[PDB]
Amino acid sequence: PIVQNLQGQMVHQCISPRTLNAWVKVVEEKAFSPEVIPMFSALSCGATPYDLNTMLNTVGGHQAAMQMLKETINEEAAEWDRLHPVHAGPIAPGQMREPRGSDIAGTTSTLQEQIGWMTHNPPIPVGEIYKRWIILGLNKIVRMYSPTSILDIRQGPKEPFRDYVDRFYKTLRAEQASQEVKNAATETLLVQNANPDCKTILKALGPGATLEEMMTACQ
Amino acid sequence: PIVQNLQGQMVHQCISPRTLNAWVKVVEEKAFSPEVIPMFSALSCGATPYDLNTMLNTVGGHQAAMQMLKETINEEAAEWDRLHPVHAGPIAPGQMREPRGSDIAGTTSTLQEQIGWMTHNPPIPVGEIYKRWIILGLNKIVRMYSPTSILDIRQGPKEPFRDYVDRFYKTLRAEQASQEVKNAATETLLVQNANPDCKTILKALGPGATLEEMMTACQ
Amino acid sequence: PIVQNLQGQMVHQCISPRTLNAWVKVVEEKAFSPEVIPMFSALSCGATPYDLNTMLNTVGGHQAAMQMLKETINEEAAEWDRLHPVHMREPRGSDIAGTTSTLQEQIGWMTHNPPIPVGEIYKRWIILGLNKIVRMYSPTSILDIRQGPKEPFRDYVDRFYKTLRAEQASQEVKNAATETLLVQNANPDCKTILKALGPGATLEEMMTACQ
Amino acid sequence: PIVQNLQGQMVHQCISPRTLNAWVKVVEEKAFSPEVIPMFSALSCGATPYDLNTMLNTVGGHQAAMQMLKETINEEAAEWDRLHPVHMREPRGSDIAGTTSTLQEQIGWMTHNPPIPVGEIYKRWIILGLNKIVRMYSPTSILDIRQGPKEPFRDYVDRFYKTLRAEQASQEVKNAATETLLVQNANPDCKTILKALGPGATLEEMMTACQ
Amino acid sequence: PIVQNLQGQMVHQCISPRTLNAWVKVVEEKAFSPEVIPMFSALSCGATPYDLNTMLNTVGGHQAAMQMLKETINEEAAEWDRLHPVMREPRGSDIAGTTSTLQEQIGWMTHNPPIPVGEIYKRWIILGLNKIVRMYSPTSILDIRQGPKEPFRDYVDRFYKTLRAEQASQEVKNAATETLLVQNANPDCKTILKALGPGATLEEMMTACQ
Amino acid sequence: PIVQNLQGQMVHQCISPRTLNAWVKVVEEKAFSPEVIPMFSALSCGATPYDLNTMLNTVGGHQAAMQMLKETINEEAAEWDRLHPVHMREPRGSDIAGTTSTLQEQIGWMTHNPPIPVGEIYKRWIILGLNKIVRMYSPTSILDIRQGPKEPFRDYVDRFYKTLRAEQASQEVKNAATETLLVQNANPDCKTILKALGPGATLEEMMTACQ
């Protein structure tokens, strides 16, 4: 985070012990369940790339994921370098140097420069850009660490329909399917993978049935 | 949440780790008991649509319920578009745009626009409007996840009357009864579903008996 | 709660997660023991009717008690309406309870000159309805609190004045019971010692005597 | 507690949920061990009589002690009335205890020139009444604290001065007991060593000698 | 602690429930292990004598140590009176907080020049606590000997833990690396340590016996 | 930490009890796992040398590590003295470590123009000394991390890059081992698949291949 002191100068505020401990415990408890990504975006709110690396470094295990996270950050950093060229004009007084991909990731940039890009006019939100790469790389990890595929989620003979749909849309969240696929799967794979008792009831409802009606029907 | 900084500018303050952890743990412990809904309204006090989505996304399980919650949000968003039409023509620079249904849900609107609408005179409470849609969709989930119907709540032979009334008005809360239906059932289903020993005492009290007198009578 | 922001405007501040969790856990743990009422009044300090309903609604179980609490709130609301006819607008009984009044209106009445403490009025009704619940949920009657043969006198007096608190006896009755029902319901060994002390004996001297 | 708001007006701020929960848990865990009194004085720092009653009312059990505590508060209130006749109004004994005085009046007396600290006066009565409870609830007397044959001297002295704190001994007795009752109640092995040290021995030298 | 209010007036702020509970639990858990002294100095940072006595009084057990702590406070108070004959000038009993109000203590602390009665009194408490830690140390440094199968890392943890409670100088701790640490090692690690020769850091010694 | 008071004067603010307890527990729980170092750099944010010593002194066990940490601090202090002769006074090595410098001087150097970041310089020495400890306390060598017969490849890579982190390998060494030692130490089933992928394979493609 960044704060303006009484002098009007933009200074780096330290990340609190509650936030650091919160981020450590959720990774310890939830590993890489899909809800970890919204929790990371919440705890790292308004953070600099320096603060984002602090939170990533504090994670103890899961170094296979962290090494993959670095590779995704390197790929996004090289993509930034390509389509943002480094202009040959002399650096205007009071304006900062143009942010490079490695500067946004925080490897080759100081904390003062990061505050400079974030607070100057126009602002270059290197914190938000870098967090976009991290969440992007974390989504890939969640997709890989997902144990079951959506095609294998089939309802049991005695399993309640409510529990089956919980597993179905849990798997669909880890596989990071689009929202339209999630809405579409209601009338396609969800009915197909149901047991013969619920499937007969679901087909009788016909097309265009909301999930509310489908769970009421198999109750 | 929103805060007025030292300059007097309305800035978005981070949702605290205490609030986030509180909302996560209540969903883990209480699932979808009726008291979860007041807890959400309390924890999400003064939140932007961005903050409401943060709280909803951090929920780990119950993806069947969350998928139904999305459908109810889409239905309320489309209803907003119907009776508040928006002329989405190109708007002059610096001019607040009229809130669309998807803007209230937070999918197609920035965090700055949401603060703009909320801290306006007169205020356009996109945070409160969106919370109304969420609680509306949450009440439907509680009704569905309610296991027993009010008609099946019958007092046992040796069960104390106090415990039976605890179960009765708990079931009646999940089934989302009106206050008049809850007040009226005191002289209808509560007496009818009582055991023969207490029912004889309750009929002797006659009409117009408060719940206080009924519980004293069967003690 | 209510706060004055930097601008000088009276704004509603959100009830903290600590208070909400504190009030939920004490109802979960203590149910309706007499010490829950002072805990409620303490946690709901300076609250609007909106905040009071939030704390009451967050209670999970005990819906029999909450339904009785509504009836006591409705009875007090009609009594307010009878004593205050309706011609900022003057608060109606349902406005004090928070059913037919906005959060801005409640802040208006509380931060007015002269102030109309709708929060304190409504909390007075809530504590009133909660006291009836504590009396009802009291398991034993004060007449049934009798000291055991091997029970220490200290424990018997702990049970005695605990029951007397749930039955909502007056402070004067509580002071008076020291020489009447407390001595009468004691076991024979301590009762002989208590009568030897005579009239006008403090509880300090009584518990020292049966030690 | 009391706070000066933005306007400069002294307003009552609510006691925090941390403080209330802290005071509840210590009474549940420690009952009436001597350290509960300094814990009470710390948590109730700068409190009004209203806040002191809030903390006292939130205590769940120990109603025998709470009933004795009321009697000590009444006795100190009557002593105040005798030394201070009643003609801002002058605070009477029942006003200091907080039964017959509003929260605004209590703020008036505390934030006055010259200040009448009814909060500190009432806390002095409470701590006085609580010390009587700790003195009574002490299980063993100082004369019965004797060192075992195999008990280490360190543990015996821990028990000795723990009892002496609950028995609310004076500072002089605590210093003096080092050379009298601490040596007298020691076991024959340590007592022989303690007498060899002679007069005027600090507790440091006595515990080093029996190590 | 002390705070400057909105008016600019120095008022005493209440010690927080977190701090009090923190100080109570560390004494319950750690008893009088050497790290309790720095924990006390940190939690009682900027405290008045009134606040220091609040923290000392809240300790439940260990009244033998607390009684010894009182005697050391009395001895240091008499030493202050001998060097300083008698705003009023603070006497020894005023620094300990027995014969001085909370307003006087704030007066001395927020004075020009400041009379740090809080820092002076904390120096006496830490001094008396150091004596307690030295006494409550169970083993002597001479009895800390490495086992036959004990790892060298664990032996050095015990060695310098004992050496901390026995309150050895910083120089004594550094010098013992090649003297008593090697002498009290097992014959397998001792042979390795002597081969390293003089002037070996603790890093090289633990790598050698790994 | 350092704060600017209302007057504009730079004063030292107390290290919070949350921070102190956080740093103590992570050392109790994690000992000297590699993630302890970023946790230390985060908890000691903006701290003076006095505050850094407070955090180091509060550590209870691991005195073997703390004694080695002192030796590394002494070595870096002597290196500072060699590169900076001593003629506000200029900070010497022992002043940066905080042994021979007051808290006011440390604030003087830190809050000055130009700033002499004695807090950041001293923290650089501590993290340097902690990195040496983590390398020593690492149990297994990278050469011994071999995948089992039935072990999933994901778990083997977790162990591999955990060991590689404690040994404080460079980023290039971590990147290079993906196609070198990680493939060599895999089991015969996964190694056959990994060689078939050929050169230039990311870790993502390797873990998908052995799934």
Coordinates of N, CA, C and O in Angstrom, one line a residue, chain B residues 77-176:
Chain B
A77 N -30.9 -7.6 -12.7 CA -30.2 -6.7 -13.5 C -31.0 -6.4 -14.8 O -31.1 -5.2 -15.2
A78 N -31.6 -7.4 -15.4 CA -32.4 -7.2 -16.6 C -33.7 -6.4 -16.2 O -34.2 -5.6 -17.0
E79 N -34.2 -6.7 -15.0 CA -35.4 -5.9 -14.6 C -35.1 -4.4 -14.4 O -35.9 -3.6 -14.7
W80 N -33.9 -4.1 -13.9 CA -33.5 -2.7 -13.8 C -33.4 -2.1 -15.1 O -33.8 -0.9 -15.3
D81 N -32.8 -2.8 -16.1 CA -32.7 -2.2 -17.5 C -34.0 -1.9 -18.1 O -34.2 -1.0 -18.8
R82 N -35.1 -2.7 -17.7 CA -36.4 -2.5 -18.3 C -37.0 -1.2 -17.9 O -37.4 -0.4 -18.7
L83 N -37.1 -1.0 -16.5 CA -37.9 0.1 -16.0 C -37.0 1.4 -15.8 O -37.6 2.4 -15.6
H84 N -35.7 1.2 -15.8 CA -34.8 2.4 -16.0 C -34.1 2.3 -17.3 O -33.0 1.7 -17.3
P85 N -34.6 2.8 -18.4 CA -33.9 2.8 -19.6 C -32.7 3.7 -19.6 O -32.8 4.8 -19.1
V86 N -31.6 3.3 -20.3 CA -30.4 4.1 -20.4 C -30.1 4.4 -21.8 O -30.1 3.4 -22.7
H87 N -29.9 5.6 -22.2 CA -29.5 6.0 -23.6 C -27.9 6.0 -23.6 O -27.3 7.0 -23.3
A88 N -27.4 4.8 -24.0 CA -25.9 4.6 -24.0 C -25.3 5.3 -25.2 O -24.3 4.7 -25.8
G89 N -25.7 6.5 -25.6 CA -25.0 7.2 -26.6 C -23.7 7.8 -26.1 O -23.4 7.7 -24.9
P90 N -22.8 8.3 -26.9 CA -21.6 8.9 -26.5 C -21.8 10.1 -25.6 O -22.5 11.0 -26.0
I91 N -21.2 10.0 -24.4 CA -21.5 11.0 -23.3 C -20.4 12.0 -23.2 O -19.2 11.7 -23.5
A92 N -20.7 13.2 -22.9 CA -19.7 14.3 -22.7 C -18.7 13.9 -21.7 O -19.0 13.2 -20.7
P93 N -17.4 14.4 -21.9 CA -16.4 14.1 -20.9 C -16.6 14.8 -19.6 O -16.9 15.9 -19.5
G94 N -16.4 14.0 -18.5 CA -16.6 14.5 -17.1 C -18.0 14.3 -16.6 O -18.3 14.7 -15.5
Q95 N -18.9 13.7 -17.4 CA -20.3 13.5 -17.1 C -20.6 12.1 -16.6 O -20.2 11.1 -17.2
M96 N -21.2 12.0 -15.4 CA -21.6 10.7 -14.8 C -22.5 10.0 -15.8 O -23.5 10.6 -16.2
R97 N -22.2 8.8 -16.0 CA -23.2 8.0 -16.8 C -24.2 7.4 -16.0 O -24.0 7.1 -14.8
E98 N -25.4 7.1 -16.6 CA -26.5 6.5 -15.8 C -26.2 5.0 -15.5 O -25.6 4.3 -16.4
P99 N -26.5 4.5 -14.3 CA -26.1 3.2 -14.0 C -27.0 2.1 -14.7 O -28.2 2.2 -14.7
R100 N -26.3 1.2 -15.4 CA -27.0 0.1 -16.0 C -27.0 -1.1 -15.1 O -26.4 -1.1 -14.0
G101 N -27.9 -2.1 -15.4 CA -28.0 -3.2 -14.5 C -26.7 -4.0 -14.2 O -26.4 -4.3 -13.1
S102 N -25.9 -4.2 -15.3 CA -24.6 -4.8 -15.1 C -23.6 -3.9 -14.4 O -22.7 -4.4 -13.8
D103 N -23.9 -2.6 -14.4 CA -23.0 -1.7 -13.6 C -23.3 -1.8 -12.1 O -22.3 -1.7 -11.3
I104 N -24.5 -2.1 -11.8 CA -24.8 -2.2 -10.3 C -24.2 -3.5 -9.8 O -23.7 -3.6 -8.7
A105 N -24.3 -4.6 -10.6 CA -23.7 -5.9 -10.2 C -22.1 -5.8 -10.1 O -21.5 -6.6 -9.5
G106 N -21.5 -4.8 -10.8 CA -20.1 -4.6 -10.8 C -19.3 -5.3 -11.9 O -18.1 -5.3 -11.8
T107 N -20.0 -5.9 -12.9 CA -19.3 -6.6 -13.9 C -18.8 -5.6 -15.0 O -17.6 -5.7 -15.4
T108 N -19.6 -4.6 -15.4 CA -19.2 -3.7 -16.4 C -19.1 -2.2 -15.8 O -19.7 -1.3 -16.4
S109 N -18.4 -2.1 -14.7 CA -18.3 -0.7 -14.1 C -17.0 -0.7 -13.3 O -16.8 -1.7 -12.5
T110 N -16.3 0.3 -13.3 CA -15.0 0.4 -12.6 C -15.3 0.7 -11.1 O -16.4 1.1 -10.7
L111 N -14.3 0.6 -10.3 CA -14.4 0.9 -8.9 C -14.6 2.4 -8.7 O -15.2 2.8 -7.7
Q112 N -14.0 3.2 -9.6 CA -14.1 4.7 -9.5 C -15.5 5.1 -9.8 O -16.1 6.0 -9.1
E113 N -16.2 4.5 -10.8 CA -17.5 4.9 -11.1 C -18.5 4.5 -10.0 O -19.4 5.3 -9.7
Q114 N -18.3 3.4 -9.4 CA -19.1 3.0 -8.2 C -19.0 4.0 -7.1 O -20.0 4.3 -6.5
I115 N -17.8 4.4 -6.8 CA -17.6 5.5 -5.8 C -18.3 6.8 -6.2 O -18.8 7.5 -5.4
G116 N -18.2 7.1 -7.5 CA -18.9 8.2 -8.1 C -20.4 8.2 -7.8 O -20.9 9.2 -7.3
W117 N -21.0 7.1 -8.1 CA -22.5 7.0 -7.9 C -22.8 7.0 -6.4 O -23.8 7.6 -6.0
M118 N -22.0 6.4 -5.6 CA -22.4 6.3 -4.2 C -22.2 7.6 -3.4 O -23.0 7.9 -2.5
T119 N -21.2 8.3 -3.7 CA -20.8 9.6 -3.0 C -21.4 10.8 -3.8 O -20.7 11.9 -3.8
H120 N -22.5 10.7 -4.4 CA -23.2 11.7 -5.2 C -24.3 12.3 -4.4 O -24.7 11.8 -3.4
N121 N -24.8 13.5 -4.8 CA -25.9 14.2 -4.2 C -26.9 14.5 -5.3 O -26.7 15.4 -6.2
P122 N -28.1 13.8 -5.4 CA -28.5 12.7 -4.5 C -27.7 11.5 -4.7 O -27.3 11.2 -5.9
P123 N -27.5 10.7 -3.7 CA -26.7 9.5 -3.9 C -27.4 8.4 -4.7 O -28.6 8.2 -4.6
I124 N -26.7 7.7 -5.6 CA -27.2 6.6 -6.3 C -26.6 5.4 -5.7 O -25.6 4.9 -6.1
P125 N -27.4 4.8 -4.7 CA -26.8 3.7 -3.9 C -26.6 2.4 -4.7 O -27.4 1.4 -4.4
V126 N -25.7 2.3 -5.6 CA -25.5 1.1 -6.4 C -25.0 0.0 -5.4 O -25.3 -1.2 -5.6
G127 N -24.4 0.3 -4.3 CA -24.0 -0.7 -3.3 C -25.2 -1.2 -2.6 O -25.3 -2.4 -2.4
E128 N -26.1 -0.4 -2.2 CA -27.3 -0.8 -1.5 C -28.3 -1.6 -2.5 O -28.9 -2.6 -2.1
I129 N -28.4 -1.1 -3.7 CA -29.3 -1.7 -4.7 C -28.7 -3.1 -4.9 O -29.5 -4.1 -5.0
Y130 N -27.4 -3.3 -5.1 CA -26.9 -4.6 -5.4 C -27.0 -5.5 -4.2 O -27.2 -6.7 -4.4
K131 N -26.8 -5.0 -3.0 CA -27.0 -5.8 -1.8 C -28.4 -6.3 -1.7 O -28.6 -7.4 -1.2
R132 N -29.4 -5.5 -2.1 CA -30.8 -5.9 -2.1 C -31.0 -7.1 -3.0 O -31.8 -8.0 -2.7
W133 N -30.3 -7.1 -4.2 CA -30.4 -8.2 -5.1 C -29.8 -9.5 -4.5 O -30.3 -10.6 -4.7
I134 N -28.6 -9.3 -3.8 CA -27.9 -10.5 -3.2 C -28.8 -11.1 -2.1 O -29.0 -12.3 -2.1
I135 N -29.3 -10.3 -1.2 CA -30.1 -10.8 -0.1 C -31.4 -11.4 -0.7 O -31.9 -12.5 -0.2
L136 N -31.9 -10.8 -1.7 CA -33.1 -11.4 -2.4 C -32.8 -12.8 -2.9 O -33.5 -13.8 -2.7
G137 N -31.6 -13.0 -3.6 CA -31.2 -14.3 -4.1 C -30.8 -15.2 -3.0 O -31.0 -16.4 -3.1
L138 N -30.3 -14.7 -1.9 CA -29.9 -15.5 -0.7 C -31.1 -16.1 0.0 O -31.1 -17.2 0.5
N139 N -32.2 -15.3 0.1 CA -33.4 -15.8 0.7 C -34.0 -17.0 0.0 O -34.6 -17.9 0.6
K140 N -33.9 -17.0 -1.4 CA -34.4 -18.1 -2.1 C -33.6 -19.4 -1.8 O -34.1 -20.5 -1.8
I141 N -32.3 -19.2 -1.7 CA -31.4 -20.4 -1.4 C -31.8 -20.9 0.0 O -31.9 -22.2 0.2
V142 N -32.0 -20.1 1.0 CA -32.3 -20.6 2.3 C -33.6 -21.3 2.3 O -33.8 -22.3 3.0
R143 N -34.6 -20.8 1.5 CA -35.9 -21.5 1.4 C -35.7 -22.9 0.8 O -36.3 -23.9 1.3
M144 N -34.8 -23.1 -0.2 CA -34.6 -24.4 -0.8 C -33.8 -25.3 0.1 O -34.2 -26.5 0.2
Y145 N -32.8 -24.8 0.7 CA -31.9 -25.6 1.6 C -32.6 -26.0 2.9 O -32.0 -26.8 3.7
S146 N -33.8 -25.4 3.2 CA -34.5 -25.7 4.4 C -34.9 -27.2 4.3 O -35.6 -27.6 3.4
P147 N -34.6 -28.0 5.3 CA -34.9 -29.5 5.1 C -36.3 -29.8 5.4 O -36.9 -30.6 4.5
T148 N -36.9 -29.4 6.4 CA -38.3 -29.7 6.8 C -39.3 -28.7 6.4 O -38.9 -27.5 6.3
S149 N -40.5 -29.1 6.1 CA -41.6 -28.2 5.9 C -42.3 -27.9 7.2 O -42.3 -28.8 8.1
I150 N -42.9 -26.7 7.3 CA -43.6 -26.3 8.6 C -44.6 -27.3 9.0 O -44.9 -27.5 10.2
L151 N -45.3 -28.0 8.0 CA -46.3 -29.0 8.3 C -45.8 -30.2 9.0 O -46.6 -30.9 9.7
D152 N -44.5 -30.5 8.9 CA -43.9 -31.7 9.5 C -43.4 -31.5 10.9 O -43.0 -32.4 11.5
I153 N -43.3 -30.2 11.3 CA -42.8 -29.9 12.7 C -43.9 -30.2 13.7 O -44.8 -29.4 13.9
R154 N -43.8 -31.4 14.3 CA -44.8 -31.8 15.3 C -44.1 -32.1 16.6 O -43.0 -32.7 16.6
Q155 N -44.7 -31.8 17.7 CA -44.1 -32.0 19.0 C -44.1 -33.4 19.4 O -45.1 -34.2 19.2
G156 N -43.0 -33.9 19.9 CA -42.8 -35.3 20.4 C -43.6 -35.5 21.6 O -44.2 -34.6 22.3
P157 N -43.7 -36.8 22.0 CA -44.4 -37.2 23.2 C -43.8 -36.6 24.5 O -44.4 -36.0 25.3
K158 N -42.5 -36.9 24.7 CA -41.7 -36.4 25.8 C -41.0 -35.1 25.6 O -40.3 -34.6 26.5
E159 N -41.1 -34.5 24.4 CA -40.4 -33.3 24.0 C -40.9 -32.1 24.8 O -42.2 -31.9 24.8
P160 N -40.1 -31.3 25.4 CA -40.6 -30.1 26.1 C -41.2 -29.1 25.0 O -40.7 -29.0 23.9
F161 N -42.2 -28.4 25.5 CA -42.9 -27.4 24.5 C -41.9 -26.4 24.1 O -42.0 -25.9 22.9
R162 N -41.0 -25.9 24.9 CA -40.0 -24.9 24.6 C -39.2 -25.3 23.4 O -39.0 -24.5 22.4
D163 N -38.7 -26.5 23.3 CA -37.9 -27.0 22.2 C -38.7 -27.1 21.0 O -38.2 -26.8 19.9
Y164 N -40.0 -27.6 21.1 CA -40.8 -27.7 19.9 C -41.1 -26.3 19.3 O -41.1 -26.2 18.0
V165 N -41.3 -25.3 20.1 CA -41.5 -23.9 19.6 C -40.2 -23.4 19.0 O -40.2 -22.6 18.0
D166 N -39.0 -23.8 19.5 CA -37.8 -23.4 18.9 C -37.6 -24.0 17.5 O -37.2 -23.3 16.6
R167 N -38.0 -25.2 17.3 CA -37.9 -25.8 16.0 C -39.0 -25.2 15.1 O -38.7 -25.0 13.9
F168 N -40.2 -25.0 15.6 CA -41.3 -24.5 14.8 C -40.9 -23.1 14.1 O -41.0 -23.0 12.9
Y169 N -40.5 -22.1 14.9 CA -40.2 -20.8 14.4 C -38.8 -20.8 13.7 O -38.6 -19.8 13.0
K170 N -38.0 -21.8 13.9 CA -36.8 -21.9 13.1 C -37.1 -22.3 11.7 O -36.7 -21.7 10.7
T171 N -38.0 -23.4 11.6 CA -38.5 -23.8 10.3 C -39.2 -22.7 9.6 O -39.0 -22.5 8.4
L172 N -40.0 -22.0 10.3 CA -40.8 -20.9 9.7 C -40.0 -19.8 9.2 O -40.4 -19.1 8.3
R173 N -38.8 -19.6 9.7 CA -37.9 -18.5 9.3 C -37.2 -18.9 8.0 O -37.1 -18.1 7.1
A174 N -36.8 -20.2 7.8 CA -36.2 -20.6 6.6 C -37.2 -20.6 5.4 O -36.8 -20.3 4.3
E175 N -38.4 -21.0 5.7 CA -39.5 -21.0 4.7 C -39.9 -19.6 4.4 O -40.9 -19.5 3.6
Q176 N -39.3 -18.6 5.0 CA -39.6 -17.2 4.7 C -41.0 -16.8 4.8 O -41.6 -16.2 3.9

